[PDB]
């Protein structure tokens, strides 16, 4: 799919993700949610190759909720993205590799901080303030490196969000139909509903 | 590169980087991406070097035939278009460039136009070219307004090329103001990205991931 | 498209008086795009230290198989690997991936615990041993680090000048590579004591 | 690379270069090309370095373990037969090219391997980018009955034609003499052209001319 | 390469030059391009010199194998090793290699395998490179029943030519004769054959 | 654009005392077929200068008859043409150097490398090469083709700079060339045993040998070389 | 296919003093792994104070001086015997190089002379034309090599004042003709010991108002 | 450049004209005008190669003028049509074809009626009740062979034109940034400026 | 295609196959490819039949124009005017032709032009696909000064050869006799030439 953003606030993550879903000359959708729960404090966010993607999402949503039950214990959002990125390490050398690039946002219950991983296909991992997939990160990390703290709130962080999709929705080509916006902190995970 | 314009209340803000790449080779820091047409006109040069300034001091050179034979300055949509007209008979033969023509004029007053050798010839308020074009483009987006101060539209002008000489790998070494007004342009000299940098991160209390 | 010039970044080493230096830029990026400016290059297994360029994803793939292998190691062996007998670790595992490579340019640095010899040693792609007396380098603009290496060193410096010079030799050469920069960090090594330095250099 | 290989009357000498490149760049001004496959058998090593290093290795194990098995000395015949069935297995892809030299209960052999496993015998052989300069001056010097200094000096006066003559070759000659009845003796540098000459200036610094940042002790103790 | 073989009365007689090439550079200019697969079975090779050699080694191993269980091996059943190799290794294989060998109850054998693997029992054979320029010549002088001097002499001028217009060709001529009496290595310079 | 069919090989020269050396074999082959075997590739310019040229052989022809048209042009309207005004050696190559370059500049190269060979007015000794692309350089000594890779490192051990050409004779150095010679047609697949050599001194004057021979060769070593390594037979 | 174009190795280095230049140039030459010459000059005198280096390809390199040479003659012949002073000589080749825009001059040109006011001036070109005026600048084969050390110790890059701890930077202290000589033979040095096509010799052009000086070293010729 | 529509109505021609100039990555400008008035009751809308496309028209517009001073007269639609069509067919088999598409809204003042031409650049002509150039005709004839009347008003002309542009708004990937509409009729051209 | 000129002590004999293909497929199986430029110069042509035609056509004219000028040309001259031909057009042209004459001055004369453009002159050429296969044998048994009976005897057995090997090759054996005494036709059917 296009464009995935993330970016990590004082007391949380922020994901936003495009809505739209563009099968060559048309969009056939308007309302998809490119991410996927991980864990109860941590979200997945993705675009890629087609079909690749959510295969993908699913297959890593899967062995994670299969780790919480064995230990009945979540995983720091460090371990799932080191999990994550050997998966990717390890499909891009494989016959058919996963064509898919991910970010990971997660709040640590032991550390009580908001963390974000940006995972590329090759397996490359960086843990990053704020970060971006695609041609996103082209219009987007000149106004994130101005506007961007580590203090910053929530609300504050969604301020700073919405100047980045007005950007992309000025000077990107393709119509993508807005974002989903989702904050992962200490309560859990849960959806902007109005953006 | 990263080249940038745009008009607003007192004129033309014209702001570029100075580095020259040949693949991953850092070929020179110290390019001269404006050109001093007249005392009116500037232009601005990104994608092949000597396309951009040979083409560019030839159209100094027909900009003052022009007013040798009608008495006159050279309009800035004229001048662009003597430009465009040229790189148009050279299309398909390779040509890379990537230029905004900007000036004043009584009858215009502050124009500018981007000039592109595949024959594009726009005008507009707003113009970035060049590798780094998106990161400028951030910038100046979400602090443009046409009620600028001549220091403020300066300083913003600077930051949305100094944002690109960051995250542009193929940009950066130094920034070249120009202030173009109903008078001329006027230089604001050079401006080493690596002091730069540093400077507004501390001043502005940007750029905190990275560290300093 | 080529995999050892996608990411970017350089590591350079050097010898001195009882003492060696390990180096690294900080630079990730996706070709033209920088992503991380924290993206350090250079890891230590006990009082060994690797620095790997190339291609992100094996850079980091390798780290985590050499601690894995240097673990394993010090539990059977009874003591930490020395830099000689790493640097064979490291060839015969890049040499096992002979025809389906890691993308890397690693280099080895440290002081043998006994002899209390300095070592450098560097690597291709595949598993040749480049053992040098003077200093090795690596990566996107090791072209510019062998110009710099080869006028700036002279042997048996001080830890503190030997500092001085190799971090000369990386920032000058990082600042003519476009892949190359967005911070440094320079290790000084002795026999029983180690510096860590980031470095303040331009930021484009 | 020039590597060469030259019999005499009671032996065999061998003899290279020490320059590794990465296309006009040079990695390694004093590169190792002389190889103990075991104690009294040698051999030298150009294309690839990774694929020459590794091939000698593999073929000096299997040859250790075999003279172990047999309770024998090794033999260059055993060397070059395992050598070049591994080569031809790998259809020339393990880019070694080989002057293979030794003595044995047998006598004296010299020997080459292309990398696509082909063999050669003659007196005198030689491989490499310099391996037309080096043969020219073979061809024209070589008589055969040399005596063990005879053999040496035309054996690194044609690696000198490559060190000269030839880009990809330099620096140092290394020559390795295997005679019989006598132990191997492995010449390190055995020729150097005199040096690096001194520098017009030093380039050491002033200390504190480098910025920094932050500092930190580094915990490599348990 | 100038490979030729040729029966007569007593036996048979190989014939080859001592060039190896890599593009114009001759790499080995004394090369023995006549080889020994059994006491008196012997081939000649040409194409590439690792592919030729490797089957070469391979024949050997299966003869001496044979032999072991077996007693001497025919011509032909060594022919037929060579032919079982390059027949079924064709797509990955460059070799031309001609068979001679001297059994008591058939004497003199010649046996040809090109590159396809096919299998080509004569009376003389010709192979490699400079033979094209000599099929005229050895057609219009060849006779069966020829004595040793006439047949030495017969592989000596064609191969001559064969030398002196093939430039992948050249060196020294290597002959093995192959009779009753036993094996025996000839070999001719340059000066001897050039004037011819 | 072509491609060469009727090719010769290597020309091999250098300088002496007194003079120059130049010398190339009379073979003329047809890819691998050795096809022409008496073919004159030295083309001596009055008595002065000689152009050794190695390559495509129409083209050599084509600059044989440029060089006969050059000297004719020369004389008309001229005096001193046998004097003051002869044709120089660096007349020679100049001008040829400049129809090299014009003509792969027209993307239609003269497929050959050349090497002119001569002696000036003031006694100096002339030795420049130019090839296909126009590329001219000068050395003590000069090679083409194989003789590059062969002839020079042996040439270069008798006059390794410019200091060693007033200590070489040339007795020497038509030893060296003779030898390079030698070693070319062991080694190089496309020689012929058949060469011609020139002298061009500055006291007596140019020497043409023709229908010279490789001699004094060493094959009696092949005899003991049997097999490709365990064969005994 | 007839490639036009061919790689004769070679660098060059140009340096700007206060009243004076430098243009300094290896004499090797070469194709590939061979050596055509150990001494063949590349930096030329092309009169009215101008030196001239054109590095690549030899034979546009050659070209291009010629036709730099012809135009001085000819800027005397129309222009009443004026000197052609550094910057309209620089102009002059931008027009030379970028009127073969579609079928370049494959080579890397750099002067070097006086400017009016007599300060030291060295330019730089593209193959197609492209000129700036500069302090410092190698080209050719070892530029890489060379460039990050100019940077470093001509315009002290990097380098700070010791004890303010990377707040002031070193000064930029003019450098003599003795000094840049220096940095020229350490810099020609260093990219003969890690550059196979640089070697033999180093001629250096002085420029200054009295005329052009000359200035010859050896370099290893491995 | 992009999407290009026509449609005439009863007394006049409509044709819309998106207005974005998209050069690779960035959206240059929101506000290109992709027409030229080639006479007071003649105007021609354009897409196609960058350069070719206002290089063209420009060149056209000059040889109509011209016409018109020389003869003190205005071309019929048909006429500038048909000239138009034989430069295209001309310029198609030239050493570098003009890459342009365009249509051609004119109001015939001797017939009093609205006129519509589909030109490509290979100098295909055909006369149509409404037209499109690119991708857009995939979506926007559907609707049209649904709607469209020849008796329609040009306000029904402009509330079917809205019913188009919100189909390819909805369906096509690319943000063409809206549309320019402009109306021709027997007083003339004028530009609708709120659409 | 299989060609040769050979001079002997009263002139010069020209030879040739007469075969034309097409692929595998002969297209003429009696063609002519001897061919009359002058009363007494005449050439054999290899290679594309129709390039071949074409410059044997213009080279008639050019030849046929200087005689009316200058009077009779010389072997020589007919031989510059094919090679100035053969190489200005060389990059679209496929020719490999021997240029044979008689003067009384000169007598026989043979010149062969290869692909290139390039002029050689010899005492007998041989030239075409079939040629490769008698380098040997022509080598061998060519004489100088040999009778005419002895040259076409040289002919037909060389061309014979050629024609056995050489599937681009055969037909009948052409030949054209070229003295001070006029111009003979010679023709030699299959039955003839490959009992030999
Ligand atoms: B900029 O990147 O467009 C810049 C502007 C120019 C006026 C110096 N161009 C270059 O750096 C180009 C390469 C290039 C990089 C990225 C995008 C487009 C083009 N370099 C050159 O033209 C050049 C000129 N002389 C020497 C080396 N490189
Ligand atoms: B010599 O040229 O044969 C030499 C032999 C010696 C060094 C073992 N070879 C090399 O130096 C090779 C050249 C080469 C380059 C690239 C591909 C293949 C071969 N060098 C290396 O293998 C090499 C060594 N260290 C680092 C990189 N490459
Ligand atoms: B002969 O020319 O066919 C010869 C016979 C071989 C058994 C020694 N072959 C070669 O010389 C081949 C190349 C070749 C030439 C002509 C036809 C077919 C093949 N050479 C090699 O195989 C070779 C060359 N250099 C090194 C190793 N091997
Ligand atoms: B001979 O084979 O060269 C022959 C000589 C020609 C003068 C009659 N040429 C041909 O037969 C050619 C094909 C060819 C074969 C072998 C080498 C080169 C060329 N044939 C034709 O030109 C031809 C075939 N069919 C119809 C017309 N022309
Ligand atoms: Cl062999
Ligand atoms: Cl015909
Ligand atoms: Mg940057
Ligand atoms: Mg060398
Ligand atoms: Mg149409
Ligand atoms: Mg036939």
Redesign the interface.
Same mark, same amino acid.
């Given at each position: 799919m296009d464009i995935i953003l993330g970016i990590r606030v004082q007391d949380s993550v922020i994901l936003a993700s495009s809505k #739209?879903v563009?099968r060559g000359? $048309? *969009?056939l959708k =308007?309302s998809d949610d490119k991410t996927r729960q991980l864990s109860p404090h941590t979200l997945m966010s993705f675009a890629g190759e087609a079909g690749d993607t959510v295969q993908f999402a699913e297959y890593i949503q899967a062995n994670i909720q299969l780790y919480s039950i064995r230990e009945d214990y979540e995983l720091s959002p460090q371990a799932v993205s080191s999990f994550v990125?050997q998966e990717? #390490?390890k499909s891009?050398?494989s016959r058919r590799p996963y064509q898919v690039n991910v970010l990971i946002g997660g709040y640590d219950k032991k550390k009580n901080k908001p963390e974000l991983y940006?995972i =590329?296909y090759?397996?490359?991992? *960086? %843990?990053? !303030? @704020?970060?971006a997939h695609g @041609?996103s990160?082209? &219009?987007?990390? $000149?106004?994130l =490196?101005?506007? &961007?703290? !580590?203090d910053m709130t929530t609300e504050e962080g969604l301020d700073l969000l919405k100047?980045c999709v007005? %950007?992309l %929705?000025?000077? /990107? !080509? /393709?119509?993508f139909k807005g974002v989903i916006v989702k904050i992962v902190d200490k309560d859990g995970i849960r959806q902007v509903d109005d953006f | 590169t990263t080249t940038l314009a745009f008009r607003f209340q007192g004129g033309i803000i014209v702001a570029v980087d100075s580095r020259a790449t040949a693949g991953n080779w850092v070929a020179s820091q110290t390019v001269k991406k404006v050109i001093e047409i007249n005392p009116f006109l500037l232009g601005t040069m990104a994608g092949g070097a000597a396309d951009c300034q040979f083409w560019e001091t030839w159209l100094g050179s027909q900009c003052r035939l022009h007013e040798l034979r009608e008495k006159e300055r050279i309009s800035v949509a004229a001048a662009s278009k003597i430009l465009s007209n040229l790189v148009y008979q050279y299309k398909g033969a390779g040509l890379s460039m990537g230029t905004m023509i900007c000036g004043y004029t009584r009858k215009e007053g502050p124009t500018i136009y981007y000039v592109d050798s595949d024959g594009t010839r726009l005008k507009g308020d707003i113009f970035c070219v060049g590798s780094g074009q998106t990161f400028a483009y951030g910038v100046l987006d979400s602090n443009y307004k046409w009620d600028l101060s001549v220091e403020d539209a300066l300083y913003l002008g600077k930051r949305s090329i100094l944002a690109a000489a960051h995250r542009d790998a193929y940009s950066g070494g130094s920034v070249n103001l120009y202030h173009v007004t109903e008078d001329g342009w006027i230089y604001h000299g050079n401006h080493d990205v690596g002091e730069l940098f540093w400077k507004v991160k501390e001043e502005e209390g940007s750029f905190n991931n990275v560290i300093g | 498209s080529d995999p050892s010039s996608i990411n970017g970044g350089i590591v350079v080493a050097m010898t001195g008086k009882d003492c060696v230096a390990i180096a690294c830029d900080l630079r990730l990026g996706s070709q033209s795009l920088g992503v991380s400016n924290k993206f350090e290059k250079i890891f230590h297994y006990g009082h060994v230290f690797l620095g790997i360029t190339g291609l992100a994803t094996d850079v980091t793939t390798l780290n985590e198989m050499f601690r894995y292998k240097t673990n394993l190691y010090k539990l059977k062996e009874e003591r930490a690997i020395e830099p000689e007998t790493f640097t064979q670790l490291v060839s015969s595992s890049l040499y096992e991936r002979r025809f389906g490579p890691y993308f890397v340019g690693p280099v080895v640095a440290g002081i043998n615990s006994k002899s209390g010899k300095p070592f450098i040693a560097g690597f291709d792609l595949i598993g040749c041993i480049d053992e040098a007396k003077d200093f090795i380098v690596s990566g996107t603009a090791s072209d510019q680090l062998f110009g710099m290496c080869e006028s700036l060193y002279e042997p048996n410096l001080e830890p503190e000048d030997l500092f001085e010079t190799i971090s000369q030799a990386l920032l000058n050469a990082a600042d003519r590579d476009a892949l190359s920069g967005w911070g440094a960090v320079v290790y000084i090594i002795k026999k029983d004591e180690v510096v860590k330095r980031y470095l303040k250099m331009r930021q484009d | 690379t020039t590597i060469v290989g030259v019999k005499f009357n009671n032996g065999v000498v061998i003899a290279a270069d020490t320059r590794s490149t990465q296309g006009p760049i040079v990695a390694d001004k004093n590169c190792a090309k002389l190889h103990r496959i075991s104690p009294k058998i040698w051999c030298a090593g150009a294309g690839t370095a990774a694929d020459t290093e590794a091939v000698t290795q593999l073929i000096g194990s299997n040859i250790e373990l075999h003279s172990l098995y047999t309770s024998r000395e090794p033999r260059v015949v055993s060397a070059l037969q395992m050598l070049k069935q591994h080569l031809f297995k790998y259809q020339g892809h393990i880019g070694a090219y080989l002057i293979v030299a030794g003595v044995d209960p047998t006598g004296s052999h010299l020997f080459s391997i292309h990398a696509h496993g082909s063999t050669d015998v003659g007196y005198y052989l030689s491989l490499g980018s310099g391996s037309l300069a080096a043969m020219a001056v073979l061809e024209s010097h070589w008589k055969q009955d040399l005596t063990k200094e005879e053999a040496i000096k035309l054996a690194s006066d044609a690696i000198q034609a490559g060190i000269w003559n030839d880009l990809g070759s330099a620096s140092n000659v290394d020559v390795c003499v295997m005679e019989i009845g006598k132990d191997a003796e492995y010449l390190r540098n055995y020729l150097t052209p005199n040096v690096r000459e001194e520098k017009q200036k030093s380039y050491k610094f002033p200390r504190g001319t480098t910025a920094v940042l932050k500092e930190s002790i580094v915990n490599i103790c348990d | 390469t100038s490979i030729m073989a040729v029966t007569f009365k007593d036996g048979v007689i190989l014939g080859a030059d001592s060039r190896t090439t890599t593009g114009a550079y001759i790499a080995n200019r004394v090369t023995d391009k006549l080889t020994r697969v059994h006491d008196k079975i012997w081939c000649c090779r040409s194409g590439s010199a690792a592919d030729t050699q490797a089957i070469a080694d391979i024949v050997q191993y299966h003869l001496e194998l044979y032999t072991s269980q077996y007693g001497t091996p025919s011509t032909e059943t060594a022919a037929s090793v060579f032919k079982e190799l390059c027949y079924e290794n064709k797509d990955n294989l460059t070799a031309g290699i001609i068979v001679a060998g001297y059994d008591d109850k058939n004497k003199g054998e010649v046996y040809t395998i090109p590159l396809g693997g096919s299998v080509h029992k004569l009376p003389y054979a010709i192979a490699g490179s400079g033979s094209t320029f000599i099929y005229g010549y050895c057609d219009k002088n060849f006779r069966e029943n020829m004595s040793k001097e006439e047949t030495v002499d017969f592989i000596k001028h064609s191969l001559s030519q064969a030398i002196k217009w093939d430039g992948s060709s050249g060196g020294v001529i290597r002959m093995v004769v192959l009779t009753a009496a036993g094996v025996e290595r000839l070999i001719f310079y340059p000066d001897e054959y050039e004037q011819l | 654009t072509q491609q060469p069919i009727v090719t010769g090989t290597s020309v091999i020269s250098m300088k002496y005392d007194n003079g120059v050396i130049i010398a190339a074999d009379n073979l003329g082959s047809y890819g691998s077929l050795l096809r022409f075997n008496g073919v004159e590739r030295l083309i001596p310019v009055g008595d002065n200068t000689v152009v050794g040229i190695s390559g495509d052989i129409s083209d050599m022809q084509h600059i044989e008859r440029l060089l006969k048209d050059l000297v004719t042009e020369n004389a008309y309207d001229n005096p001193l043409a046998d004097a003051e005004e002869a044709l120089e050696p660096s007349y020679i190559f100049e001008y040829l150097a400049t129809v090299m370059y014009q003509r792969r500049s027209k993307m239609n190269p003269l497929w050959n490398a050349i090497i002119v060979a001569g002696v000036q007015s003031n006694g100096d000794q002339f030795l420049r090469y130019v090839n296909l692309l126009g590329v001219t350089y000068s050395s003590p000594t000069l090679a083409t083709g194989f003789g590059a890779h062969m002839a020079n490192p042996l040439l270069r051990k008798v006059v390794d700079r410019e200091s060693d050409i007033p200590k070489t004779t040339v007795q020497v150095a038509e030893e060296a060339i003779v030898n390079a010679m030698r070693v070319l047609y062991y080694r190089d697949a496309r020689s012929s045993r058949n060469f011609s050599l020139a002298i061009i001194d500055k006291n007596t004057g140019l020497t043409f040998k023709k229908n010279l021979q490789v001699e004094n060769m060493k094959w009696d070593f092949a005899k003991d070389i049997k097999g490709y390594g365990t064969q005994k037979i | 296919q007839f490639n036009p174009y061919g790689d004769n190795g070679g660098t060059i280095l140009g340096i700007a003093g206060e009243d004076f230049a430098v243009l300094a140039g290896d004499t090797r030459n070469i194709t590939d792994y061979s050596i055509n010459s150990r001494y063949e000059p590349k930096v030329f005198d092309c009169g009215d104070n101008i030196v001239m280096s054109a590095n690549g390809f030899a034979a546009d390199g050659d070209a291009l001086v010629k036709r730099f040479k012809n135009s001085v003659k000819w800027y005397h012949f129309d222009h009443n015997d004026k000197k052609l002073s550094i910057n309209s000589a620089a102009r002059n080749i931008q027009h030379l190089l970028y009127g073969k825009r579609f079928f370049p001059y494959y080579v890397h040109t750099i002067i070097a002379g006086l400017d009016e006011d007599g300060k030291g001036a060295v330019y730089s070109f593209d193959p197609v034309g492209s000129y700036e005026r500069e302090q410092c600048r190698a080209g050719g084969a070892a530029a890489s090599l060379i460039m990050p050390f100019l940077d470093n110790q001509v315009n002290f890059k990097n380098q700070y004042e010791p004890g303010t701890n990377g707040k002031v930077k070193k000064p930029l202290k003019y450098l003599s003709v003795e000094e840049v000589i220096k940095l020229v033979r350490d810099s020609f040095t260093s990219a003969t010991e890690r550059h196979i096509q640089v070697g033999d010799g180093l001629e250096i052009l002085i420029v200054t108002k009295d005329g052009v000086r000359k200035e010859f070293y050896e370099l290893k010729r491995d």
């Open positions: #739209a563009t000359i $048309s *969009v =308007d990125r990717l #390490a891009i050398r940006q =590329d090759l397996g490359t991992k *960086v %843990e990053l !303030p @704020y970060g @041609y990160g082209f &219009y987007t990390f $000149s106004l =490196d101005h506007h &961007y703290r !580590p100047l007005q %950007e %929705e000025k000077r /990107m !080509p /393709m119509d | - | - | - | - | - | -």
